[PDB]
Design a protein around this ligand. Structure first.
Ligand SMILES: OC[C@H]1O[C@@H](O[C@H]2[C@H](O)[C@@H](O)[C@@H](O)O[C@@H]2CO)[C@H](O)[C@@H](O)[C@H]1O
Ligand SMILES: OC[C@H]1O[C@@H](O[C@H]2[C@H](O)[C@@H](O)[C@@H](O)O[C@@H]2CO)[C@H](O)[C@@H](O)[C@H]1O
Lengths: 137, 137
């Protein structure tokens, strides 16, 4: 289920931050934050905290396939507890921060950064805030 | 031209703030921030700073017609200068703040507040940030 979507047709990458605040309803499910590229609504970056297994899975869905999963070692979320996730893009990576700690970097696979125009947030997250802000390099 | 859109299907009214930061490119045009209700994509609240005439026009587009315009006395924008617009909804009004000053209140005409799920920002605004945050009553 779609919880939030945003569209910025001029392109929200690189040099933008997305800050999502909220909490899960359960410890048995998952949510995702996806950055989509146009045309095709391909998934440039999929950030998928899975609470049942306590793993963050990151990947891309390009040319109709999921690529190699990048799975984080730590799981710095607690179910039903408020969190802040920030995703900041530079020319080389998405940088992920949770509760103001840097957690992981994900190297761009979709190199056409300016075609990333859409953000989708799905599944088990009760959102309290979404901020989309142009930062600079 | 669409500059930004957001969708929050559970309803982003009442008790939410939208904070838009940016600046115009010209002093000859206009921009708008629209709150849309579902179904129908009706315009519950249209906030339309018109720089050519230095007037903020507010209205609603319901049942296929614009209603009575509510035109503000002051015009606290300057073309090409960064501004912050906050729109906060309670049970009775949209409250508009520009650069942290309260400017106007617009009484709800679309009373089905929970059906307001979409935000659109159009025309002459170069956006630097959009924040959508659940505040409370
Ligand atoms: O790689 C991200 C996608 O994973 C898909 O699930 C994988 C799963 O992680 C893996 O362990 C294996 O079982 O194959 C599954 C199917 O590709 C998700 O279904 C998808 O939503 C993404 O999260
Ligand atoms: O009321 C908001 C809409 O106004 C429309 O323009 C009006 C205009 O403000 C008024 O002075 C008169 O000329 O009738 C026009 C047409 O209804 C805009 O076209 C529309 O976009 C809204 O801003």
């Amino acid at each position: 289920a779609l919880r939030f979507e945003a569209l910025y047709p001029e392109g929200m990458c690189p040099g933008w931050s997305v800050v999502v605040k909220g909490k899960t309803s359960s410890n048995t499910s998952m949510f995702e934050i996806n950055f989509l590229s146009h045309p095709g609504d391909q998934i440039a970056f999929h950030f998928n905290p899975r609470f049942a297994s306590s793993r963050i899975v990151c990947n891309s869905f390009l040319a109709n396939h999921w690529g190699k999963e990048e799975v984080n070692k730590t799981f710095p979320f607690e179910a039903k507890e408020p969190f802040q996730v920030e995703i900041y893009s530079d020319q080389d990576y998405f940088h992920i921060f949770i509760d103001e700690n840097k957690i992981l970097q994900y190297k761009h696979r979709q190199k056409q950064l300016s075609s990333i125009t859409k953000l989708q947030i799905l599944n088990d997250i009760e959102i309290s805030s979404v901020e989309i802000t142009k930062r600079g390099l």
